[PDB]
Amino acid sequence: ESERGAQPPFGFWDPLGLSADGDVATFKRRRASEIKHGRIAMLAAMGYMTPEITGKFPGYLSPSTGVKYADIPNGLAAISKVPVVGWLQIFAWTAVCELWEDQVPGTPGHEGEFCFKAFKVTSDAPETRETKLASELANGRLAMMAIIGLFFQDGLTGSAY
Amino acid sequence: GGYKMSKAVPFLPMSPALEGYVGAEEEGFDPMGFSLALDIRWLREAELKHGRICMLATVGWIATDLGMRLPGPAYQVSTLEAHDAMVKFGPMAQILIWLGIIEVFSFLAITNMMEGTTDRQPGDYGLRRLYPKDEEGQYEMQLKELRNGRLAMLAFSGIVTTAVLTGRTWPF
Amino acid sequence: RKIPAGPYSVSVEPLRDGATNEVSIVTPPISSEGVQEYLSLAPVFFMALAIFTSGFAIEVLRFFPDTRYW
Amino acid sequence: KETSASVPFLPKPKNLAGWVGGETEFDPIGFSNWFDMKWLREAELKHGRVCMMATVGFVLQPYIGAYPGVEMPADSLQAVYAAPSEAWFAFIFAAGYIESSSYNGKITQLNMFEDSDRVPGNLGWGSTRLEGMSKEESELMQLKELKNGRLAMLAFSGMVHHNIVVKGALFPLVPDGWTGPEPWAVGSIMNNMG
Amino acid sequence: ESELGAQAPLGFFDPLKLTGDGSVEAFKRRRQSEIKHGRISMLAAMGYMTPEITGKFPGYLSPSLNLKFADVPNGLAAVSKVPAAGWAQILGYMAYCETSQDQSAGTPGAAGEFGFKVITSDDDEVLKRKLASELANGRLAMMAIIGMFYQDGLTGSAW
Ligand SMILES: CC(=O)O[C@H]1CC(C)(C)C(=C=C/C(C)=C/C=C/C(C)=C/C=C/C=C(C)/C=C/C=C(C)/C=C/[C@@]23O[C@]2(C)C[C@@H](O)CC3(C)C)[C@](C)(O)C1
Ligand code: KC1
Ligand SMILES: CC1=C(C#C/C(C)=C/C=C/C(C)=C/C=C/C=C(C)/C=C/C=C(C)/C=C/[C@@]23O[C@]2(C)C[C@@H](O)CC3(C)C)C(C)(C)C[C@H](O)C1
Ligand SMILES: CC1=C(C#C/C(C)=C/C=C/C(C)=C/C=C/C=C(C)/C=C/C=C(C)/C=C/[C@@]23O[C@]2(C)C[C@@H](O)CC3(C)C)C(C)(C)C[C@H](O)C1
């Protein structure tokens, strides 16, 4: 499985802790886990940098309760103030994104193949496909370390940055 | 040599009505022999319905007693008086109506599985989604569902009993 | 059925050997077709019709008390 | 064995095989087995059409005013009280003529679909548009009509009961200081401590 | 692949390369994207230019809200003035136009052919002229519309 995946730095198959002794099912499970983790990390790091670069907090997140976009602090303090059913609906959209199609072993969802199709690598060129997915994986790992470091910085410093 | 015993209660033979079901090959816990006198399909339907209801109810109690409350002045009541304030407010009857629709269709499911008009399994409603394709994975997932359901039944029982006894949030 | 038991019995034959680990469901073997047929009986159907008519009259009297619109 | 596509935990209902909306085969209770499917389809189409016209009327009544003299109330429920008697009689006459000449008097559940080629829901109002097209396209148009009919039935029910709970107009939803609907009046078995 | 847009006075404009990797259906998908973006950008640019010369045409916009056609300003300001129902109807028209015909690859909808025609060729070689004119106008209108966006965003006024 050393020839699978991305390895952008090249020659960088890294089992380090010898995690994969050789089992296709466990490796595919962890590949789905890593690709999902990377997508989540990239999205979260975007939603973490955006409130600071372009503040852009227009209007009330809760017109009835009174929760304003500009009163939720950026970072970890968000999960006390984003409205109750606001968090419920965010969770529900994650549920829709994860439960619309099947992500079980033996299905394309287990490989990360989803219904987004917002890059459409054009199968006639099945060579930029590997580049696109490798870049996605590597960027997901980078934003993975990034987002966990950002959360730790938020916890230690007391605010987002 | 014979009389396959209950792995849970080792001094009582396992009820033959348990054969082919999820919790029989490892526990087989039917000491009173309800499956010997009641249809095991109906018993499994009841067990899974109770487990799912309790698994929802436990997290509902957790949320309600942790401050998770809908954005409404009428919703600012404690869990103990929640099912009097919401009964008078109306939404309890509303939940009753919608769950009654769902349970009427569940009644149709039960009264179609018993006559053989469907190959539906007792707890099955068709929701596959996070369902393994491999049969062993399906069995393990069903066992996880059953164990979580039973654990949450006991957990919700304890939660409501202790909350009524000593009015507190949840850790008590 | 040598032991005298009533018709439509869910009882196993009491003439059995040493203790049997058998499944004997004590619940009536009813049928959905049979239940629907029974609820379609003239007594059942017409008493249900009478109850429905009486309740409809009750609700009309409740929401429109007396003959105010005569 | 076979199970309904819409309800996977219930048997596939028969008598829905060749029909416009039958591919989803949704019939849990099973009025298909009890009643003529032609009558059920005619009733569904008529309900959907009536409720679509009712929905556009309910929405547009407080707008398009009314007959010179009557005050179309913002809440469309009181329009029946504000309607002139002559207008009601004309509406009743028009509905009776339209619905009684459509079936040549065979306007009853026992006699409507007994002649022969009475297509369910085909009153002849612009059926020529379906006379062309190509089967799948015509069935697609009929399915559009059916889905819009069901949507408007549910929507009109919702509009009526919204006007009931709010005791006001349809569009000013959830007025200021709402704090939930008022508890329902009149007694019940639970009102007298059941 | 030097067609359609190859009529440009510049030529087969490929800065940053792209489409050099035999990406034939990527080329067709980018053709669809270019055609759709051009059409919407031309519509937008016309709907920005018209409200100043022969300004907001008289009328009324929202029965209950008392919004007129003269109340709603132009530019990025007008975003938060059309009522929720009005924006719903506009986006519904967008959705109906998008979903009317199949835009999947290989279909006539996969090249901008939706049967609109109106200004169409007489099948006398001017079809390519018309297609290229539409493509060039849309290409220009895209940068024009982005520039007008930036002008409204920075200056604040509709101009
Ligand atoms: C206060 C003040 O004065 O500040 C002002 C500031 C300002 C800016 C003036 C304002 C304004 C006006 C506006 C509305 C400005 C709009 C700007 C827009 C719409 C930007 C969208 C870019 C979309 C892109 C690039 C999509 C790009 C898509 C791409 C690149 C696709 C890229 C592909 O990689 C993908 C996805 C697959 C590849 O295989 C192929 C290719 C094509 C390369 C404000 C906000 O009002 C206020
Ligand atoms: C078209 C369907 C739809 C409607 C019609 C709708 C409407 C309302 N949404 Mg919702 N919503 C989605 C769909 C819809 N929302 C989706 C797909 C998401 C992505 C996850 C999403 C996100 C949030 C968040 C994060 C919050 C939120 C709330 C409210 C709210 C206020 C009620 C009130 O103020 O009484 C109303 C009326 C905010 C809140 O205030 O809840 C109290 C809150 O925080 N929503
Ligand atoms: C085995 C098994 C499982 C399991 C399990 C588990 C965890 C089972 C646990 C079951 C459990 C934990 C059952 C509770 C008993 C507690 C009781 C009865 C309380 C008595 C308390 C009473 C009667 C109250 C007494 C008083 O109130 C009085 C009378 C008045 C007060 O003044 C004084 C006090 C308060 C003292 C899985 C994993 C879930 C599924 C798997 O498949 C099989
Ligand atoms: C057939 C025929 C013809 C015809 C025709 C006609 C008349 C066709 C008409 C079609 C028509 C009239 C279709 C309406 C649909 C209405 C819907 C779907 C309602 C949605 C409403 C919904 C979904 C819900 C609304 C809500 O209100 C609810 C429930 C609660 C409120 O709080 C919130 C809101 C407001 C959101 C020709 C062409 C004239 C001649 C030809 O020869 C024959």
XYZ file of N, CA, C and O in Angstrom, chain A residues 49-140:
368
model
N -10.595 31.313 9.795
C -9.884 32.468 9.256
C -10.840 33.535 8.735
O -10.556 34.732 8.858
N -11.967 33.126 8.149
C -12.882 34.085 7.528
C -13.437 35.116 8.503
O -13.451 36.309 8.155
N -13.901 34.758 9.706
C -14.441 35.790 10.608
C -13.432 36.855 10.996
O -13.838 37.942 11.427
N -12.135 36.584 10.865
C -11.116 37.562 11.222
C -10.668 38.403 10.032
O -10.521 39.623 10.161
N -10.447 37.780 8.873
C -9.989 38.525 7.703
C -11.083 39.466 7.215
O -10.925 40.692 7.227
N -12.206 38.906 6.786
C -13.395 39.678 6.442
C -14.416 39.420 7.543
O -15.094 38.387 7.541
N -14.508 40.354 8.490
C -15.399 40.211 9.626
C -16.782 39.777 9.196
O -17.185 38.643 9.465
N -17.490 40.661 8.498
C -18.717 40.331 7.777
C -19.672 39.509 8.647
O -19.945 38.333 8.400
N -20.157 40.165 9.696
C -21.143 39.571 10.590
C -22.466 40.324 10.480
O -22.919 40.917 11.466
N -23.123 40.324 9.313
C -24.294 41.190 9.141
C -25.586 40.546 9.617
O -25.937 39.440 9.193
N -26.306 41.235 10.498
C -27.602 40.766 10.942
C -27.533 39.871 12.162
O -26.481 39.632 12.761
N -28.704 39.366 12.534
C -28.863 38.503 13.695
C -28.868 37.045 13.259
O -29.600 36.672 12.337
N -28.048 36.226 13.922
C -28.148 34.785 13.723
C -29.487 34.265 14.228
O -30.070 33.351 13.635
N -29.987 34.836 15.321
C -31.320 34.526 15.836
C -32.148 35.799 15.901
O -32.030 36.570 16.870
N -32.982 36.074 14.897
C -33.836 37.270 14.969
C -34.783 37.263 16.155
O -35.089 38.330 16.699
N -35.258 36.089 16.573
C -36.191 36.013 17.694
C -35.466 36.114 19.030
O -35.786 36.973 19.859
N -34.485 35.237 19.258
C -33.754 35.255 20.521
C -32.949 36.540 20.674
O -32.845 37.089 21.778
N -32.380 37.036 19.581
C -31.523 38.201 19.622
C -30.049 37.923 19.425
O -29.233 38.820 19.664
N -29.682 36.717 19.004
C -28.281 36.378 18.787
C -27.831 36.995 17.470
O -28.337 36.643 16.400
N -26.879 37.916 17.549
C -26.357 38.628 16.392
C -25.108 37.925 15.880
O -24.326 37.385 16.666
N -24.923 37.933 14.555
C -23.706 37.375 13.977
C -22.463 38.003 14.589
O -21.427 37.342 14.716
N -22.552 39.271 14.983
C -21.421 40.022 15.504
C -21.232 39.878 17.007
O -20.327 40.510 17.559
N -22.058 39.084 17.694
C -21.838 38.850 19.114
C -21.243 37.486 19.429
O -20.732 37.300 20.536
N -21.296 36.536 18.501
C -20.643 35.247 18.709
C -19.144 35.451 18.547
O -18.688 35.846 17.464
N -18.344 35.211 19.583
C -16.891 35.321 19.423
C -16.377 34.265 18.462
O -16.863 33.132 18.439
N -15.386 34.643 17.663
C -14.793 33.695 16.733
C -13.927 32.701 17.493
O -13.042 33.093 18.259
N -14.195 31.410 17.295
C -13.411 30.359 17.907
C -14.259 29.461 18.793
O -15.449 29.248 18.535
N -13.624 28.938 19.847
C -14.276 27.944 20.696
C -15.448 28.528 21.472
O -16.393 27.802 21.796
N -15.413 29.827 21.776
C -16.528 30.460 22.471
C -17.817 30.408 21.669
O -18.872 30.781 22.194
N -17.757 29.954 20.416
C -18.959 29.862 19.601
C -19.935 28.829 20.142
O -21.152 29.016 20.024
N -19.446 27.735 20.733
C -20.399 26.757 21.240
C -20.771 27.112 22.674
O -20.514 26.347 23.612
N -21.417 28.262 22.849
C -22.311 28.525 23.967
C -23.375 29.509 23.504
O -24.426 29.655 24.135
N -23.094 30.183 22.388
C -23.839 31.354 21.953
C -24.536 31.181 20.617
O -25.592 31.782 20.413
N -23.972 30.403 19.699
C -24.733 30.052 18.498
C -26.010 29.348 18.931
O -25.944 28.408 19.749
N -27.181 29.763 18.448
C -28.440 29.319 19.057
C -28.572 27.804 19.122
O -27.943 27.056 18.371
N -29.408 27.370 20.067
C -29.570 25.948 20.364
C -29.954 25.176 19.106
O -29.221 24.293 18.642
N -31.108 25.509 18.525
C -31.503 24.856 17.290
C -30.636 25.306 16.130
O -30.623 24.647 15.093
N -29.886 26.399 16.277
C -28.865 26.700 15.286
C -27.810 25.613 15.214
O -27.471 25.122 14.132
N -27.298 25.199 16.376
C -26.378 24.069 16.410
C -27.070 22.786 15.987
O -26.467 21.940 15.317
N -28.341 22.625 16.362
C -29.083 21.443 15.939
C -29.173 21.364 14.418
O -29.003 20.291 13.833
N -29.414 22.498 13.761
C -29.541 22.518 12.308
C -28.190 22.357 11.624
O -28.106 21.746 10.554
N -27.122 22.904 12.209
C -25.785 22.652 11.672
C -25.468 21.161 11.736
O -24.968 20.559 10.772
N -25.780 20.541 12.875
C -25.635 19.098 13.016
C -26.493 18.359 11.997
O -26.068 17.343 11.438
N -27.704 18.856 11.745
C -28.592 18.212 10.783
C -28.044 18.305 9.366
O -28.198 17.371 8.574
N -27.417 19.429 9.016
C -26.812 19.525 7.693
C -25.613 18.598 7.572
O -25.384 18.011 6.510
N -24.835 18.450 8.646
C -23.780 17.440 8.625
C -24.371 16.046 8.443
O -23.815 15.210 7.720
N -25.509 15.785 9.089
C -26.184 14.502 8.933
C -26.632 14.283 7.495
O -26.534 13.170 6.972
N -27.154 15.326 6.851
C -27.544 15.216 5.446
C -26.324 14.942 4.579
O -26.358 14.093 3.681
N -25.225 15.652 4.838
C -24.007 15.450 4.068
C -23.416 14.061 4.267
O -22.709 13.568 3.385
N -23.675 13.420 5.403
C -23.081 12.116 5.662
C -24.034 10.947 5.439
O -23.577 9.802 5.375
N -25.332 11.201 5.305
C -26.325 10.140 5.234
C -27.131 10.146 3.945
O -28.051 9.333 3.812
N -26.843 11.046 3.006
C -27.598 11.053 1.759
C -27.302 9.805 0.938
O -28.220 9.150 0.432
N -26.030 9.458 0.801
C -25.601 8.251 0.111
C -24.845 7.356 1.088
O -24.623 7.711 2.247
N -24.448 6.184 0.607
C -23.883 5.151 1.463
C -22.373 5.319 1.578
O -21.687 5.535 0.575
N -21.864 5.219 2.807
C -20.435 5.301 3.092
C -19.917 4.001 3.695
O -18.954 4.003 4.463
N -20.550 2.885 3.357
C -20.240 1.592 3.958
C -19.165 0.907 3.122
O -19.077 1.162 1.912
N -18.313 0.068 3.711
C -17.366 -0.707 2.901
C -18.073 -1.490 1.806
O -19.102 -2.130 2.036
N -17.506 -1.439 0.606
C -18.134 -2.002 -0.567
C -18.919 -1.021 -1.407
O -19.582 -1.443 -2.361
N -18.869 0.263 -1.087
C -19.584 1.312 -1.794
C -18.635 2.463 -2.079
O -17.614 2.619 -1.400
N -18.937 3.285 -3.088
C -18.051 4.420 -3.394
C -17.871 5.385 -2.237
O -16.821 6.034 -2.144
N -18.864 5.508 -1.354
C -18.715 6.385 -0.207
C -17.578 5.976 0.706
O -16.940 6.827 1.331
N -17.310 4.673 0.802
C -16.190 4.196 1.602
C -14.849 4.645 1.039
O -13.847 4.614 1.759
N -14.807 5.053 -0.227
C -13.597 5.576 -0.844
C -13.583 7.094 -0.909
O -12.643 7.667 -1.468
N -14.595 7.757 -0.354
C -14.725 9.190 -0.457
C -15.459 9.671 -1.688
O -15.719 10.875 -1.804
N -15.806 8.771 -2.608
C -16.538 9.137 -3.814
C -17.953 9.575 -3.465
O -18.797 8.743 -3.121
N -18.221 10.872 -3.541
C -19.509 11.423 -3.144
C -20.188 12.098 -4.336
O -19.722 12.022 -5.474
N -21.301 12.770 -4.054
C -22.162 13.354 -5.073
C -21.881 14.833 -5.309
O -22.646 15.489 -6.021
N -20.805 15.372 -4.733
C -20.509 16.793 -4.899
C -20.221 17.120 -6.359
O -20.929 17.920 -6.982
N -19.185 16.498 -6.922
C -18.834 16.647 -8.335
C -18.587 18.104 -8.717
O -18.930 18.532 -9.821
N -17.984 18.879 -7.818
C -17.691 20.279 -8.078
C -16.287 20.493 -8.627
O -15.809 21.633 -8.653
N -15.611 19.427 -9.050
C -14.316 19.567 -9.703
C -14.294 18.832 -11.038
O -13.570 19.237 -11.954
N -15.076 17.751 -11.147
C -15.343 17.044 -12.401
C -14.079 16.830 -13.229
O -13.904 17.445 -14.283
N -13.183 15.972 -12.747
C -11.836 15.824 -13.294
C -11.836 15.307 -14.735
O -10.773 15.183 -15.355
N -13.016 15.053 -15.310
C -13.089 14.712 -16.732
C -12.333 13.430 -17.060
O -11.197 13.475 -17.540
N -12.954 12.289 -16.763
C -12.366 10.954 -16.827
C -11.466 10.707 -18.036
O -10.585 9.845 -17.974
N -11.686 11.418 -19.148
C -10.781 11.278 -20.288
C -9.339 11.579 -19.898
O -8.407 11.102 -20.555
N -9.136 12.368 -18.845
C -7.808 12.614 -18.303
C -7.691 11.985 -16.919
O -7.788 12.692 -15.909
N -7.482 10.666 -16.826
C -7.347 10.041 -15.505
C -5.928 10.144 -14.974
O -5.376 9.173 -14.448
N -5.333 11.311 -15.120
C -4.019 11.615 -14.568
C -4.038 12.861 -13.701
O -3.363 12.895 -12.670
N -4.794 13.886 -14.093
C -5.068 14.979 -13.174
C -6.005 14.558 -12.054
O -6.126 15.286 -11.068
N -6.661 13.401 -12.180
C -7.474 12.876 -11.088
C -6.616 12.568 -9.871
O -6.942 12.962 -8.744
N -5.507 11.863 -10.090
C -4.604 11.548 -8.993
C -4.017 12.815 -8.396
O -3.873 12.920 -7.176
N -3.683 13.796 -9.237
C -3.145 15.052 -8.725
C -4.176 15.785 -7.875
O -3.858 16.286 -6.792
N -5.424 15.851 -8.348
C -6.467 16.541 -7.597
C -6.713 15.864 -6.254
O -6.782 16.530 -5.215
N -6.827 14.533 -6.251
C -7.099 13.840 -4.995
C -5.894 13.871 -4.061
O -6.063 13.970 -2.842
N -4.678 13.797 -4.605
C -3.480 13.894 -3.782
C -3.361 15.269 -3.146
O -3.008 15.387 -1.966
N -3.641 16.321 -3.916
C -3.645 17.665 -3.357
C -4.722 17.805 -2.295
O -4.494 18.423 -1.251
N -5.900 17.228 -2.539
C -6.958 17.258 -1.538
C -6.505 16.596 -0.244
O -6.687 17.146 0.846
N -5.883 15.422 -0.351
C -5.439 14.692 0.832
C -4.356 15.455 1.587
O -4.423 15.603 2.815
N -3.344 15.947 0.868
C -2.251 16.661 1.522
C -2.738 17.955 2.160
O -2.335 18.292 3.280
N -3.600 18.693 1.460
C -4.157 19.916 2.019
C -5.023 19.611 3.231
O -5.038 20.376 4.202
N -5.751 18.496 3.194
C -6.523 18.097 4.353
C -5.651 17.800 5.554
O -5.980 18.181 6.674
